[PDB]
Design a protein around this nucleic acid. Structure first.
Lengths: 173, 225, 129, 70, 85, 88, 156, 66
RNA sequence: AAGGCGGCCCCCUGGACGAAGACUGACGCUCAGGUGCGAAAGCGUGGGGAGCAAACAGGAUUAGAUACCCUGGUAGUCCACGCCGUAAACGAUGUCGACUUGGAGGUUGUGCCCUUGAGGCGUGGCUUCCGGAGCUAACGCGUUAAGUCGACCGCCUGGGGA
């Protein structure tokens, strides 16, 4: 009745556009295609490569839930943009968390600068930062044991274009 | 028989994007959420029920049902549905003029049957390796094409379809013949050829399965009756 | 410019019939209203409804039997360019009596048969079949 | 396309850069265009024709793409 | 407005970047990440074979890679990145 | 075009209410003034054909208005044509 | 019970590397002497085969026509391509006053009494089609009554 | 991705030379609205401004000339 | 309005569209004769003349080459004021009004919305492409009709001769 109208605005209320609400249950796996169903018009053709973690093999069987992304609808047949970007928002949230206590702490390990800032990698992803950010002072991680364990202390981020240079070693600082 | 909540869960209410719609599906559409068309479940359900009833009735008079779905996502499922109620199906590409040109296709069917017999019942073996291979290939081809309809004998007395726009050839053939059509018709599709239109999501797998299952059940019921 | 309102109305009706429109709205006029009434009486439309005070809108509700439209044909006969007046003996028979011919007579607008019965002819507005 | 060879820059690299600059400018193309007089009509025709071609490439081909080749 | 006034940050000759590719247009790959810009890495570098390469075979779709500028025009917004480095 | 102030003045004089503006007579007056203004322009610029088209149109409109006035109410028309000095 | 009239047979050519390949088209029409009519257009390298094909075609895809006794129910126009056709019901005894292809279709249909002119083109195939269309569209009194929500005596 | 829509400028200024300089070539030419992604309405204005500047010797007509 | 109109600045000037209101109160549509505007070439008188270039000249090419190609080159193209009144002056589609499924754009307004951002939801004008019903000999046209109608005008009646 208006049961359906109310149900429609209800279902509007219990979804959003980006990859935010972890809703798609993995309902068929086959190499090399994962597929979910986050309450969209169709199922995603997911790559396998948005879902293997840091050494190459899969992590999620049937029933498992990751949100994907949206705002792009119908290229002919199908639904989404990939859930891996989803993950980027989570990374952004952790980076943002720094602001609260003026110190985000994880592990950052930066061996070298492709473009003037050591590369830092957090969990699966690896990011590039401007040259200063890698070291607090002039210490330089070239003399440090290769691909060393610290955290990342942030030196510089570009806030629009995503480049983040983070602070290896020197826990005291 | 099939509830609204279940349908919703499945994802029947979802349709195609607004730019790909057909304006003949404007009655069956409710609204457009996130630039994607939403099918009206209030109008869908009764129609669906009616269709089911019709199917049951057909079954009751010993009607032959044909299940068509060549999407390749729900090819596995449609076959299963067909087999549950021991009815016929076309899960791979519909041969142009399967029904209209039955008399030619009946020869093909016969050939296929013969091949099968040779493979299984004969137990002769001792065949030239290339020739044998060729034969096998032929058999495979036939099975893929006409596996479900090999025991159909004549023409079916009704035609269930998973997508109207995709299987338009089949639908057209049915129309030409005068076989009742029971099509699942998304917002992009054309409902004019279809007798018993079912407004619903052709694309989503779970929805398709749901559509199949109820139909199968109804057929079984009819048979029992 | 708008020169023939009745004709326009007829055209609108025809288009509605073609396009499977449930109801057809237009600016109201007395003659138009009369015509609508006549049609209703003869059973080509379901109902008509005028609505408004300053500029009222006549809304006809079209009829559909077994899918297809009821008003199979609907032509103006008299028209501003060239008027048609018939005497009671010269009054036509549309579709050999199965259709109707709206004719405006001294005793109001009526179907051709009605006019004949009365014993009077007049301006032939439109054939409807 | 004015260019200056940077300190300790190779010749070949410089040449390449120059070429790139020229390309960007569209100088050669411009020269080619102004070699002979194009009637206005002809110019119009080319522009419209080209546009049409572009449109064809964009949409019709896209439609084709939807359907698989084999 | 926003990327193009002070386009001197990743400029100077060879500043390496990490950028996700977007669409490979059979002459190109279109890696573009740094806050609303467009890069190409077209077909000539990409590898250490020139012409027979077909970029869809050789890298990816949607993947963050090794790329640096090699060239900026801040005027006809064509930053022409590379990948053979 | 005719300057706003001038237009207002014209309206006030000929219009009964002064807020009216659309009175036939007022309209005619407005047209007439514009025509007068454009005469000067067109003496100077004889080849300005496009502009002259507009003037012609305006004139036609004025004529039409006058005609309308005549059939409706003769005395008023007469008065108007005395005021403006329109030969017809 | 069904009567079948071959209206026309026409030789049609296809030019090939060698020369001209000829073939034959047969236009037939069949009817049961009541409402049911159907035309068929068959084609083959030899005439008889073509005719047979046409007949076969005709026999399927027939069409019903409401006939008030021996004649039509009202004057009816029918058009198809060039051929535009007028046919008018007529009094018992008058016979089928109609020309060519048109006549044949009428005869099979079991109209006995018509006044029928073919305006425009008289290309048999088109004209027969036109005639068929005309017949098809033609509604009966009962049908009209049903449509309009009235009795037959209200319509007269 | 137009700048002038976002800034929300009423009219582009020929005096604002720096801004103009982003939309002009290394060779002096005005840059296409495909490349810059400038809105059509604004683009024309920008062009006009550039032209004005060139007249006032604020911008150069071309790189070579002297 | 069509013909057409392209650096920048100023002066004079015509139209279009939107936003709300306020006013006038059918004043409208179409138009035989009539009047005007009307590319290019062309004409007249007076200026101008860089480039380009009918004509013309030479050099090639060729069987010939009163052409194509090359080297030159005068009317003309440019300006002023007159005349000419035609073009595949084409959308080969008269003007005005009404009505009839859709999609993807472009351009130019304008209302609301947290512009939380380049956006979101509308609503007007002009415009490019695709396509439905319908129409069409077919090709195709398809809310900018070649659909469904009304008003007025123009025009056609076998090819040639013309």
């Amino acid at each position: 009745e208006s049961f359906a109208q109310l149900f429609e605005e209800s279902l509007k209320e219990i979804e959003t556009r980006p990859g935010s609400i972890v809703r798609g249950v993995v309902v068929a796996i086959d190499k090399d295609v994962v597929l979910v169903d986050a309450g969209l018009k169709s199922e995603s053709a997911i790559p396998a490569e948005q879902f293997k973690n840091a050494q190459g093999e899969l992590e999620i069987q049937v029933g498992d839930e990751v949100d994907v992304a949206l705002d792009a609808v119908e290229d002919g047949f199908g639904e989404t943009l990939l859930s891996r970007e989803k993950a980027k928002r989570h990374e952004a949230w952790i980076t943002l968390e720094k602001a609260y206590e003026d110190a985000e702490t994880v592990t950052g390990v930066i061996n070298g600068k492709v473009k003037g800032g050591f590369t830092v990698e957090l969990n699966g992803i690896r990011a590039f930062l401007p040259g200063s950010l890698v070291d607090v002072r002039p210490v330089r991680d070239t003399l440090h044991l290769e691909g060393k364990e610290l955290e990342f202390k942030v030196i510089k981020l570009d806030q629009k274009r995503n480049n983040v240079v983070v602070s290896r070693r020197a826990v005291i600082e | 028989t099939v509830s609204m909540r279940d349908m919703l869960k499945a994802g029947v209410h979802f349709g195609h994007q607004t730019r790909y719609w057909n304006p003949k599906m404007k009655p069956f559409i409710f609204g457009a959420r996130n630039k994607v068309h939403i099918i009206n479940l209030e109008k869908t359900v009764p129609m669906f029920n009616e269709a089911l009833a019709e199917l049951n009735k057909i079954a009751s008079r010993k009607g032959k049902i044909l299940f068509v779905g060549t999407k390749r996502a729900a090819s596995e499922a449609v076959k299963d549905a067909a087999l549950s109620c021991d009815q016929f199906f076309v899960n791979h590409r519909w041969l142009g003029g399967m029904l209209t040109n039955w008399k030619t296709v009946r020869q093909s069917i016969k050939r296929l049957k013969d091949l099968e017999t040779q493979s299984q019942d004969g137990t002769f073996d001792k065949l030239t390796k290339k020739e044998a291979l060729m034969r096998t290939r032929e058999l495979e081809k036939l099975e893929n094409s006409l596996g479900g309809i090999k025991d159909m004998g004549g023409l079916p007395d009704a035609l269930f379809v998973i997508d109207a726009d995709h299987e338009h050839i089949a639908i057209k053939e049915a129309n030409n013949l005068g076989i009742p059509v029971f099509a699942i018709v998304d917002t992009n599709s054309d409902p004019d050829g279809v007798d018993f239109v079912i407004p619903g999501n052709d694309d989503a797998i779970r929805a398709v399965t749901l559509y199949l299952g109820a139909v199968a059940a109804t057929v079984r019921e009819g048979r029992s009756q | 410019s708008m020169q023939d309102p009745i004709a326009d109305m007829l055209t609108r009706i025809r288009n509605g019939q073609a396009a499977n429109k449930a109801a057809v709205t237009m600016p109201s006029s007395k003659l138009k209203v009369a015509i609508a009434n006549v049609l209703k009486e003869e059973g080509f439309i379901e109902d008509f409804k005028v609505e408004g005070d300053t500029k009222p809108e006549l809304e006809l509700t079209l009829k559909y039997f077994q899918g297809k439209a009821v008003v199979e044909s609907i032509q103006r006969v008299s028209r501003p360019g060239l008027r048609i007046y018939k005497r009671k003996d010269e009054l036509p028979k549309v579709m050999a009596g199965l259709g109707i011919a709206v004719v405006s007579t001294s005793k109001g607008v009526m179907t051709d048969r009605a006019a004949r019965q009365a014993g009077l002819g007049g301006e032939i507005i439109c054939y409807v079949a | 396309p004015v260019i200056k060879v940077r300190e300790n820059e190779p010749f070949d690299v410089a040449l390449r850069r120059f070429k790139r600059s020229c390309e960007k400018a569209g100088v050669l193309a411009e020269v080619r265009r102004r070699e002979f007089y194009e009637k206005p009509t002809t110019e119009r025709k080319r522009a419209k024709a080209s546009a049409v071609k572009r449109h064809a490439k964009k949409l019709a081909r896209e439609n084709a793409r939807r359907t698989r080749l084999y | 407005e926003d990327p193009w006034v002070a386009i001197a940050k990743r400029y100077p000759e060879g500043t390496k970047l990490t950028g996700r590719v977007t669409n490979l247009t059979d002459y190109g790959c279109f890696v573009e990440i740094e806050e609303g810009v467009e890069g190409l890495v077209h077909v000539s570098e990409m590898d250490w074979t020139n012409k027979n390469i077909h970029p869809s075979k050789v890298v990816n779709v949607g993947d963050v890679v090794e790329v640096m500028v090699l060239d900026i025009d801040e005027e006809r917004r064509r930053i022409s990145l590379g990948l053979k480095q | 075009s005719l300057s706003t102030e001038a237009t207002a003045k014209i309206v006030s004089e000929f219009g009964r209410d002064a807020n009216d503006t659309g009175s036939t007579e007022v309209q005619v007056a407005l047209l007439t003034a514009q025509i007068n203004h454009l005469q000067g322009h067109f003496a100077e610029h004889k080849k300005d054909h496009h502009s002259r088209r507009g003037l012609l149109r305006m004139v036609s409109q004025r004529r039409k208005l006058l005609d309308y006035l005549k059939r409706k109410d003769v005395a008023r028309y007469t008065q108007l044509i005395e005021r403006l000095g329109l030969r017809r | 019970e069904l009567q079948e009239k071959l209206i026309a047979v026409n030789r049609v050519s296809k030019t090939v590397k060698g020369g001209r390949i000829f073939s034959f088209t047969a236009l037939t029409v069949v009817g049961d002497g009541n409402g049911r009519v159907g035309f068929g257009y068959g084609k083959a390298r030899e005439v008889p085969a073509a005719i047979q094909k046409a007949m076969e075609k005709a026999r399927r895809n027939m069409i019903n026509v409401a006939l008030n006794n021996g004649t039509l129910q009202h004057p009816v126009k029918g058009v198809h391509t060039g051929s535009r056709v007028f046919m008018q019901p007529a009094s018992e005894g008058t016979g089928i006053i109609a020309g060519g292809a048109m006549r044949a279709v009428l005869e099979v249909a079991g109209v006995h009494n018509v006044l029928a002119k073919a305006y425009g083109s008289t290309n048999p195939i088109n004209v027969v089609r036109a005639t068929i269309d005309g017949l098809e569209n033609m509604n009966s009194p009962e049908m009209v009554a049903a449509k309009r929500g009235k009795s037959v005596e209200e319509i007269l | 991705f137009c700048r002038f829509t976002a800034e929300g400028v009423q009219e582009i200024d020929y005096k604002d030379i720096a801004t103009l300089k982003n939309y002009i070539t290394e060779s002096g030419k005005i840059v296409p609205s495909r490349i810059t992604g400038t809105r059509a309405k604004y683009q024309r204005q920008l062009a006009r401004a550039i032209k004005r500047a060139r007249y006032l010797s604020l911008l150069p007509y071309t790189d070579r000339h002297q």
